[PDB]
């Protein structure tokens, strides 16, 4: 999902449905290869010791001036018009150049 | 003439710095509801003697 050949935009993004697999976050949290690392809601240590229901992977490419709006409780040209996260967002945002 | 494009295009150049660099954003969404928790990793790493 990070080294994908093709992708979509920030408003017509393809939701990569992830199901029936073990989500190992050890190769993504402490890999020292992702520049933007935002987390909201809860700590990322609880994302590996507590089970959740639905996990979706929204893969899109956006610039750094509009990557700050992908957060609960923001505004702008993306957080109100293109892609908005819910207020009860207990996930993380991982991106790389 | 009278053909405006509100869907403006992005700009990605190698000469730009970290401000306009392409970020492969993958949003890790999580949600808890009345449905049983299924996809967060059903098993973990343990040990045995």
């Amino acid at each position, epitope marked *: 999902v990070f080294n994908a050949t093709r992708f979509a935009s920030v408003y017509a993004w393809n939701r990569k449905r992830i199901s029936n697999c073990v989500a190992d976050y050890s190769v993504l949290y402490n890999s020292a290869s*992702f520049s933007t690392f935002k*987390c909201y809601g809860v700590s990322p240590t609880k994302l590996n010791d507590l089970c959740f229901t639905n996990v979706y992977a929204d893969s899109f490419v956006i610039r750094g001036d509009e990557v700050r709006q992908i957060a609960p409780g923001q505004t702008g040209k993306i957080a109100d018009y293109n892609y908005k996260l819910p207020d009860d967002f207990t996930g993380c945002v991982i991106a790389w150049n | 003439f009278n053909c405006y494009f509100p869907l403006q295009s992005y700009g990605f150049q190698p000469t730009n710095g*970290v401000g306009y660099q392409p970020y492969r954003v993958v949003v890790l969404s999580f949600e808890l509801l009345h449905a049983p928790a299924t996809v967060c990793g059903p098993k973990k790493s343990t040990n045995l003697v």
Partner: antibody
Amino acid sequence: VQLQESGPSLVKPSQTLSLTCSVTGDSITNGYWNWIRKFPGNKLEYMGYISYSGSTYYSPSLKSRISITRDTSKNQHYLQLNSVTSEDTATYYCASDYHGSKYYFDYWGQGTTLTVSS
Amino acid sequence: DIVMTQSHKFMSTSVGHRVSITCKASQDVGNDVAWYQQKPGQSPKLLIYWASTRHTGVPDRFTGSGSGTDFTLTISNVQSEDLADYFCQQYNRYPYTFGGGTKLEIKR
């Protein structure tokens, strides 16, 4: 490459802010040159940045009263803030936000202390 | 904002003593923790990127470690000319939130 800060240090409230930062040793062709102000007491706050193409973006602390311009002919860039008050009394610094060889480098300048009061 | 709250504001380190500056983050920022170096009479420059890799032109006596939330700077065999201010900040997204800072002193 050494950065040098300049500009006026006496700006009355409800006026137009104007600063000038000069870059010696590298033209405005690659990277970013941002604005970071310094409050008395080791308190730093981000203001904005601009590339060499002309497009800029503002900090979420201010809503719409900050505009950042650049100049590739004189290798300088300006900062403009409208409707200033006593909260803008800080020492503005200029940096160099550029990357290279899968790493990030940054260096600041001398800074110019600006006082907005009566 | 993710404020990089430091644990100590000052530390007495002699020539050759190991510097240990610990900054506690309220939110996990991964590994995008950088350090500054504000010398008296010089310009503040970035020293350590990704909490382990030094800046170009700087000798290998400045290094460190850290993972997730507990980031601790480790300067082995420091000298008297390295008396500067070390700040804790982030570079993952805009705006860049800065902390208080730690000023070193030569133990005499």
